[PDB]
Amino acid sequence: GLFQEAYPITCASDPALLRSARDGEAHARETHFTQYLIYDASPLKGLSL
Amino acid sequence: WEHRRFIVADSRSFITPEFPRDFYMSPVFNIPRETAA
Amino acid sequence: MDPYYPFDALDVWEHRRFIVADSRSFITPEFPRDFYMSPVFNIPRETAA
Amino acid sequence: YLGRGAPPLLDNAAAVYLRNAVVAGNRLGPAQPLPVFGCAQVPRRAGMD
Amino acid sequence: APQFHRPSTITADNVRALGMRGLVLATNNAQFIMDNSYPHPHGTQGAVREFLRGQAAALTDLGVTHANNTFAPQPMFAGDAAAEWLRPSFGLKRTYSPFVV
Amino acid sequence: LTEACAAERVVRPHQLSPAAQTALLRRFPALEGPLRHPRPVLQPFDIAAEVAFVARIQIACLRALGHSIRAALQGGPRIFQRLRYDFGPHQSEWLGEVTRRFPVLLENLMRALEGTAPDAFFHTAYALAVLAHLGGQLVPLSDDIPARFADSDAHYAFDYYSTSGDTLRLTNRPIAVVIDEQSKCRFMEGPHRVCEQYLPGESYAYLCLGFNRRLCGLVVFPGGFAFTINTAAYLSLADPVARAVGLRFCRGAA
Amino acid sequence: WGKDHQVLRLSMENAVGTVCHPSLMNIDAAVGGVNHDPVEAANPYGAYVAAPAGPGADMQQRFLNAWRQRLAHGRVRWVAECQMTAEQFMQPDNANLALELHPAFDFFAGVADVELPGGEVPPAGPGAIQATWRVVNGNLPLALCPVAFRDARGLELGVGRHAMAPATIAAVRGAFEDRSYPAVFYLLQAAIHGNEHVFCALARLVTQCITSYWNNTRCAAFVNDYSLVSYIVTYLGGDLPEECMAVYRDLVAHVEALAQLVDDFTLPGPELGGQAQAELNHLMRDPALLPPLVWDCDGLMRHAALDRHRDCRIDAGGHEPVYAAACNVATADFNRNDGRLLHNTQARAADAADDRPHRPADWTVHHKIYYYVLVPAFSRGRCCTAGVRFDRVYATLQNMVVPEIAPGEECPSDPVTDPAHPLHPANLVANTVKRMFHNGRVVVDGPAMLTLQVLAHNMAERTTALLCSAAPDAGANTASTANMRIFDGALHAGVLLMAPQHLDHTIQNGEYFYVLPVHALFAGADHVANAPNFPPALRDLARDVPLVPPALGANYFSSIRQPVVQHARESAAGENALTYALMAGYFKM
Amino acid sequence: HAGVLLMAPQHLDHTIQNGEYFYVLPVHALFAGADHVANAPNFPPALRDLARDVPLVPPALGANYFSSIRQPVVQHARESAAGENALTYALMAGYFKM
Amino acid sequence: AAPAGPGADMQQRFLNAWRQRLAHGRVRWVAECQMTAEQFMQPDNANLA
Amino acid sequence: AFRDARGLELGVGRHAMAPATIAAVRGAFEDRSYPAVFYLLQAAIHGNE
Amino acid sequence: HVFCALARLVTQCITSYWNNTRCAAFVNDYSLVSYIVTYLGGDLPEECM
């Protein structure tokens, strides 16, 4: 409410391309032909869940 | 503030019309008691 | 073809809170006058008679 | 369709078709729909995990 | 003979008696100067109308001169036959060659 | 009246035979009206007798308009102005067109006054301002007249026509603007129509046309250039003709 | 991921409970809140509908001179075909950014108060900001729907379904874009005029013309009419090599393919507001929209007999339709102004028809497939309609030099050798139709006498500009969208002109055919910019900015707007794509 | 008994009357041409579109549920993308009992 | 149905006979547009039981 | 695709049709101009060799 | 005008040159090439048209 912001989380368009989330964003597949990923950017990044 | 030109409003400002002399010899200026309508 | 006017001109500074014995202006448009076309009433194909 | 907010379709045959078409079995879909005043009474599923 | 530079002369009898072989030449060999001292009673648009019934009804004439040439007009579609109660009405696709030696 | 005109083959019962007239009058006595009145204000024995009752009023006002427009505009006029609208310096060249544009309008206004249906004319301001005056020779219908129109003669009531392009009406509502040498304009008190926001004659592409309970009307052009018209010197409405007019067009206010 | 080592899925079937409420059609406060602080005169070319006036024959030279002034004034509301994406999102260069508010609508500067089916020249002055309605999804502007996105959807519907052969379209595209095209093919189409009975009369002409023109160009011959191509399929498909015949049968089978792509995406639900399920789903099933060439009267008998329908106003004389059963020499009054449309198309002119048609329900839908979709897939912007001087046409149709044969002589076969042949240089005088069989080489022989006896049978007066309007359908018709309009202009007795040939005085420029752009889909960049006597000032506005004469519908008051028609004259993806793509651009909203 | 398989429903033709020699009479949901049934001369125009994706068969010949072949084997055939070689065995395997 | 009459008209007698109820409701077994997990969810398969 | 998948298992090893007999048969079914003398001969021969 | 005056000469010159060479004749002048595409579109083989 104070910042008027909203954090994205670990999400993509394929369960195929969701596989490269369990290694961090080092080699996370951002983009195949249309299939797009957005890594987690949040206070909740890197945490237990 | 605001900046624009200004002319004093008086009743001596006239816009001039002309007439072609047949203007009142028009079908609507000269209507009989009953129409074809 | 210019309409007649009694006086030539003045230039008045107008303060916004200091409007007393109020007056109004006249509105003319932004496009050039070739576009404000002629008053046209055509005779229709069928008539009353 | 949980709340009343809008003018419905004037083709009233259409909207009542689409009435239950949307609210067939939503977890957030009421049974015995809206009275004049009051809440929609979102149903309770048998278990939550 | 109808004069093609005055529109007040075209009738249907004067054009149907004229063959279509000769109406090719009579249109290109006329006088370019349109005349306007005798108008038409059906209007100038009605003079074009009176010209084209003169051509369309003349198409029987160009066909009757070729009546020893083509065949009988076969019924192109169904519904055009007398006896319907046991066999249907055929429709003959007229893609053939109408020609009799 | 059918069979006395069908067995006699009388196509219109003013061509009915004089014994065939009065023998029906010996039978049914309420028919002295449509057979023996010199000029009934309703036409006897016609289908559109109520419609021809209306179209006369459409005619008779236009001559009361058309011979009054010539009256204030007999010769070369001096109209100088009636409202207060000041100019910018290059704004006067717009009125350089209004010199040239002018005389084609007054035909096409009256052409459009002809061009409306009379059923569509009774929703306009001049057809009710006369009813505010024929009730003064009674509250007219639809109560479009405000509570303060019947107070002064300074409460006018306008219509708005398009100046350029096509000369067309740009209102649904009669817009009653109270008018004060010079006199500045003022509205009255108060589903959304475009042109209804301005003063009369305030801007270009607007013809303004107001009327009164006195039935002295205004023709307001942009730039203050307006003038009264005595249409009261040209309204020739006979009261026994007009008394069937008003009663069909008035409302008894409680 | 959920609140475990667990996966989750969000579809767009997920979006069922949000986009489907009856608040998508709730724009009452929108038009009111934008209305104050008005907009000036935005020279409303595409923001105004004109009612028709006079015949269609001169209707251009009305609108050419009427919009001679407020056309070079400024620009139209769309310039975004030049704009890339996010150039719309930026604060400069888009004054119309504050006018794009709804996904299902449009806010544009239109005329103030004049009721739309009326007048010619609107009173330029104050302006209004109202609505129209966005009909199908393709009407979204091309900085919001990318061009490559349209082909992205299209190819992937392309799998699993029937497609045209890649070889055969080269014949069609060559045929569609052939400049030196034999002008009998425009004339003989209007001769048949969709009459099936005149077709099976003239089947030898139809046989040889396709047979002759194939040897000149490996190309189809008559192909701008679905009805005519449909008749070639059934009543002619025997006496041809298969290589030629493959082109037409693939064309229909692809129209067969593109037809049943709607109903694989449909659900069985009840009939509704007069319309069916399919009519509410896709635009090609609704019969209130009708193709630009309507030879019969099946369309308005479906279209005007609808609950949606309001005042199909044919304006040369009487505004409301009353129709003709059959038509002949004395019935085709070649220059009239009443608005009667002809039903003279069926095989059985003896079992005539004014109220009860002969055709299936998908027949006009098939034409709506063939005209609205496939021809823009070959157009790339270059095709436009024509209004027919059938008096000029039926002069020269029945104008042939076919000599008498000798007693004992052979059949005319070849033009250059046989002196008895109608196309022989001895039989070539100018201004006859076997000279027009000779201006483009079309071997048509001595048995052409079988034509004229039926040319004298059936004929058609002249075209007319039919303007049908309609309300939003059952399913979009709420209490703020009730007053909305969709203007759908089309010609009755008209012919499409594929290839604009005007750099040639063989047909002088608009003799038989005055152009009349009936829609932005058929708007001549070379037809209309090269018209009869003509202003040079509009040359800027002709190279772009499709000139739609406003009796035939406006830019915003139709079903198909400018965004898709640029998309037609854009991306170089295949024919199989754009067919499915523009179809996917026709899903209702 | 003495029936004949019509491949192409040709209703875009009045040369033979549409069903003159051959009344159409669908015998199973495998055999229901969408242009045979809907474009018969006596067909209700209130039942056009529902005829298109439903195999209308009078129940003297068999309904869906008491046929040996139900709707899913039909729906595989018209909708699957594969060429006929793969499509042959793919429906040929659709006849092993339960 | 029982095999009634001759074979020439039994379909044509059928479309007059079954015109009423066959348009009334949509039949059960046209669900071929339903996909997996559209089925196993309780809405959009009222026939899940 | 699954019902087509095990076809691609069984597709090997057995006879596959020629490419020419694919389109020739399929175009014959989709021949709207299929000549109807062939239907009556099929009823003329009527299984009698 | 003089093009269609000698248009038969243009036709024979091209195809006789097309017999010797696989080459186009009059590409030296676009105004000529505008004409052959416009006027002589019938009396040419398609391989050089």
DSSP letters, F106-146, are: HHHHHHHHHHS-STTTTTSHHHHHTHHHHTT--EEGGG-S-
SS3 H15: coil
Give all chains having 3 or more CB-to-CB distances under 8 Å with chain B: C, F
Q: In the structure encoding, which two tokens stand for residue G220, read together? A: 């189809």
Q: In the structure encoding, which two tokens stand for residue G453, read together? A: 């006896």
G-chain CB neighbours of E27 within 8 Å are 431
Distance from CA of G148 to the nearest CA of A (A): 12
- Residue E80: count of CB within 10 angstroms of its CB: 17
Q: In the structure encoding, which two tokens stand for residue G371, read together? A: 């005209």
* Dihedral Cα F187, F191, F195, F198, nearest 10 deg: 20
State the first-to-last Cα distance of chain D, in angstroms, to the nearest integer.
26
SS3 G36: coil
d(C-alpha G393, C-alpha G504), whole Å? 19
Partners of F160 in the β-ladder = F208
DSSP state of F144: -
Q: What amino acid occupies position G62?
A: R
- The dihedrals phi and psi of I22, each to the nearest 5 degrees, come to -75, -20
Cross-chain CB nearest to J7 (options H8, H81, H93): H93
F142: left (phi over 0), alpha (psi -120 to 50) or beta: left
F-chain CB neighbours of G45 within 8 Å are none
- Residue G443: count of CB within 10 angstroms of its CB: 19
**Selection from G540, G458, H36 nearest residue I11 by Cα:** H36
Spatial neighbors of F158 by CB under 8 A, at least 6 apart, are F125, F174, F175, F176, F177, F200, F208, F209, F210, F211, F220
Contact H4, I7 (CB under 8 A): no
Contact F123, F106 (CB under 8 A): no
* Strand F226-230 versus strand F207-211 pairing type: unpaired
Cross-chain CB nearest to G277 (options H39, H49, H80): H49
By what method was this entry solved? Answer: cryo-EM
Q: Looking up tokens 């038409």, which residue turns up?
A: E40
d(C-alpha G29, C-alpha E66), whole Å? 76
Sign of CA dihedral F55, F61, F64, F67: negative
- Interface B:F, ≥3 CB–CB pairs < 8 Å: yes
d(C-alpha G572, C-alpha G81), whole Å? 16
Chain F (64-123) residues lying within 8 Å, Cβ to Cβ, of chain B: 66-67, 69-70, 76-82, 84-89, 95, 98-99, 102-103, 106-107, 110-111, 113-114
Interface check G8 vs A, CB under 8 A: no
* Entry field: residues in chain I: 49
**Selection from F142, F156, F176 nearest residue F218 by Cα:** F156
Contact G326, G340 (CB under 8 A): no
Resolution value in angstroms: 4.5
CB pairs under 8 A between D and G: 56
> Count H helices, E strands: chain K?
3, 0
Task: Return the residue of H nearest to G268 by Cα.
Answer: H50
Spatial neighbors of G432 by CB under 8 A, at least 6 apart, are E24, G396, G399, G400, G401
Contact G496, G225 (CB under 8 A): yes
Contact E78 H15 (CB under 8 A): yes
Which H helix or E strand runs over G497?
Answer: none
Spatial neighbors of G17 by CB under 8 A, at least 6 apart, are D1, D22, D23, D26, D28
Q: In the structure encoding, which two tokens stand for residue G214, read together? A: 């194939």
Q: In the structure encoding, which two tokens stand for residue G413, read together? A: 């076969």
Sign of CA dihedral G437, G441, G442, G443: positive
DSSP state of G376: H
d(C-alpha G293, C-alpha G518), whole Å? 10
Alpha carbon A20 to chain centroid, angstroms:
10
Written in H, E and C, the secondary structure of E15-66 is: HHCCCHHHHHHHHHCCCCCCCCCCCCCCHHHHHHHHHHHHHHCCHHHHHHCC
Alpha carbon F84 to chain centroid, angstroms:
28
Find which of F78, F81, F87, F90 to mutate to test the C interface (most C CBs within 10 Å of its CB).
Answer: F87
Chain I residues with a Cβ under 8 Å from any Cβ in chain H: 1-4, 7-15, 18-19, 22-23, 27, 29-30, 32
d(C-alpha G133, C-alpha G106), whole Å? 6
Query: What is each CA distance from G449 to E20, E67, E98, F57, in whole angstroms?
Result: 12, 9, 9, 67
**Selection from F87, F81, F92 nearest residue F182 by Cα:** F81
Strands (E) across G349-442 are located at 387-388
DSSP state of G521: T
d(C-alpha H22, C-alpha H34), whole Å? 16
Spatial neighbors of A47 by CB under 8 A, at least 6 apart, are none
Contact G494, G390 (CB under 8 A): no
Contact B25, C14 (CB under 8 A): no
Partners of F230 in the β-ladder = F216
* Dihedral Cα G537, G539, G542, G545, nearest 10 deg: -60
d(C-alpha F64, C-alpha F236), whole Å? 7
Contact G237, J33 (CB under 8 A): yes
Q: In the structure encoding, which two tokens stand for residue F148, read together? A: 């303060």
Burial letters J4-38, b for 16+ CB under 10 A, else e: beebeeebeeeeeeeeeeeeeeeeeebbbbbebee
Sign of CA dihedral G516, G519, G524, G528: positive
Find which of G156, G195, G228, G234 to mutate to test the H interface (most H CBs within 10 Å of its CB).
Answer: G234
DSSP string for H24-44: ----BTTB--HHHHTTSSS--
Q: Looking up tokens 């790339």, which residue turns up?
A: G380
DSSP state of F162: -
DSSP string for I8-47: TSHHHHHHHHTTTTTTTS--TT--TT--TTTSSSSTT-GG
Task: Tell me whether residue F7 is exposed, middle or buried, using C-beta atoms within 10 angstroms of its C-beta: 0 to 12, 13 to 18, 19 or more.
Answer: exposed
Q: Looking up tokens 């026709």, which residue turns up?
A: G586
Contact E79, H14 (CB under 8 A): yes
SS3 F150: coil
> Count H helices, E strands: chain C?
0, 0
SS3 K17: helix
Query: What is each CA distance from F172 to F113, F127, H90, I37, I49, in whole angstroms?
Result: 15, 13, 71, 57, 61
Q: In the structure encoding, which two tokens stand for residue A21, read together? A: 């989330």
**Selection from F204, F138, D24 nearest residue G17 by Cα:** D24
Q: In the structure encoding, which two tokens stand for residue A40, read together? A: 């987690």
Q: What amino acid occupies position G535?
A: P
Spatial neighbors of F43 by CB under 8 A, at least 6 apart, are F49, F52, F53
Strands (E) across F39-174 are located at 139-140, 157-161
Which H helix or E strand runs over G110?
Answer: strand G109-110
Spatial neighbors of D22 by CB under 8 A, at least 6 apart, are D1, D29, G16, G17, G20, G21
Find which of B29, B30, B33, B34 to mutate to test the F interface (most F CBs within 10 Å of its CB).
Answer: B29
Task: Tell me whether residue E13 is exposed, middle or buried, using C-beta atoms within 10 angstroms of its C-beta: 0 to 12, 13 to 18, 19 or more.
Answer: exposed
Cross-chain CB nearest to G20 (options D5, D8, D18): D18
* Entry field: residues in chain A: 49
- Residue G476: count of CB within 10 angstroms of its CB: 22
- Helices J2-10 and H84-92 meet at what angle, rounded to 10? 100
Find which of G9, G11, G267, G281 to mutate to test the I interface (most I CBs within 10 Å of its CB).
Answer: G267
Cross-chain CB nearest to I30 (options G268, G270, G271): G268
d(C-alpha F63, C-alpha F180), whole Å? 29
d(C-alpha K19, C-alpha G470), whole Å? 62
SS3 G408: coil
Contact G170, G177 (CB under 8 A): no
Give all chains having 3 or more CB-to-CB distances under 8 Å with chain F: B, C, G
Contact B28 F102 (CB under 8 A): no
Spatial neighbors of D48 by CB under 8 A, at least 6 apart, are none
Spatial neighbors of J38 by CB under 8 A, at least 6 apart, are none
DSSP string for G277-331: HHHHHBTTT-TTS--SB--SSHHHHHHTSSSSEE-----SS-SS----S---TTT
E-chain CB neighbours of G207 within 8 Å are 95
Spatial neighbors of G7 by CB under 8 A, at least 6 apart, are A15, A18, G1
Query: What is each CA distance from F14 to F21, F34, F37, F47, F53, in whole angstroms?
Result: 9, 9, 11, 15, 19
Contact G16, G91 (CB under 8 A): no
- Interface G:C, ≥3 CB–CB pairs < 8 Å: yes
SS3 F103: helix
